[PDB]
Design a protein around this ligand. Structure first.
Ligand SMILES: O[C@@H]1[C@@H](O)[C@H](O[C@@H]2CO[C@@H](O[C@@H]3CO[C@@H](O)[C@H](O)[C@H]3O)[C@H](O)[C@H]2O)OC[C@H]1O
Ligand SMILES: [Cl-]
Ligand SMILES: [Cl-]
Ligand SMILES: [Cl-]
Ligand SMILES: [Cl-]
Ligand SMILES: [Cl-]
Ligand code: NA
Length: 194
């Protein structure tokens, strides 16, 4: 097992991982065998951590385990595109705060209905440094921890709603995210190209 407490990306037991924190409170990620990781956080500022793939794509993502936010946290298939720069989220679980934005319609996927939203961040941290970019959101209408995410269903719905992804030149991870919160997660990811 390897504990991560400091910003970095890399590979562990055949899986890509990303850890990122603004440095508030206490945040750790433990990288275990195959696709397993755990997180522990107390009074965090903002962090995103998880395992997945060096590049995004159309992938049937299978995951399982636990996700226990006290306050604001997300469980999301998460990644970035280039040209345009986009931060994208397929959110299966959350805490006290449900992600919202400009409502674009729904998509049905993996036993659930997802609300689609677009938001925009100005001069914020990104995989290209301090940048302005849109965020694309699929938010499940009912919370869960575990199952399949057919990323194709989301990407295609986004495209029908005029939300175009760039190139899959950056990571795609099954992410734990917290904001001014405490919690834990213990997750396993796997997947294959549709
Ligand atoms: O060390 C470099 C990092 O600074 C950089 O990491 C990305 C920075 O932005 C992170 O996304 C934020 C997460 O919180 C959301 O609410 C915000 O909208 C985002 O700003 C992302 O997780 C990191 O990968 O990338 C390059 C690194 O070398
Ligand atoms: Cl649902
Ligand atoms: Cl916005
Ligand atoms: Cl500017
Ligand atoms: Cl749960
Ligand atoms: Cl499912
Ligand atoms: Na658009």
């Amino acid at each position: 097992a390897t504990v991560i407490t400091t910003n970095q990306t890399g590979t562990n037991n055949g899986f890509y991982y990303s850890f990122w924190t603004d440095g508030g409170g206490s945040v750790s990620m433990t990288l275990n065998s195959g696709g397993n990781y755990s997180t522990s956080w107390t009074n965090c500022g903002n962090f995103v951590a998880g395992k997945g793939w060096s590049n995004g794509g159309r992938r049937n993502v299978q995951y399982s385990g636990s996700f226990y936010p006290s306050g604001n946290g997300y469980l999301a298939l998460y990644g970035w595109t280039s040209n345009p720069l986009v931060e994208y989220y397929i959110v299966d679980n959350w805490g006290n705060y449900r992600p919202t934005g400009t409502y674009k319609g729904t998509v049905t996927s993996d036993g659930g209905t997802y609300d689609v939203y677009q938001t925009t961040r100005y001069n914020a941290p990104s995989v290209e440094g301090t940048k302005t970019f849109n965020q694309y959101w699929s938010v499940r209408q009912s919370k869960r921890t575990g199952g399949t995410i057919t990323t194709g269903n989301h990407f295609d719905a986004w495209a029908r709603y005029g939300m175009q992804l760039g190139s899959f030149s950056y990571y795609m991870i099954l992410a734990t995210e917290g904001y001014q919160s405490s919690g834990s997660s213990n997750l396993t990811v796997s997947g294959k190209l549709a």
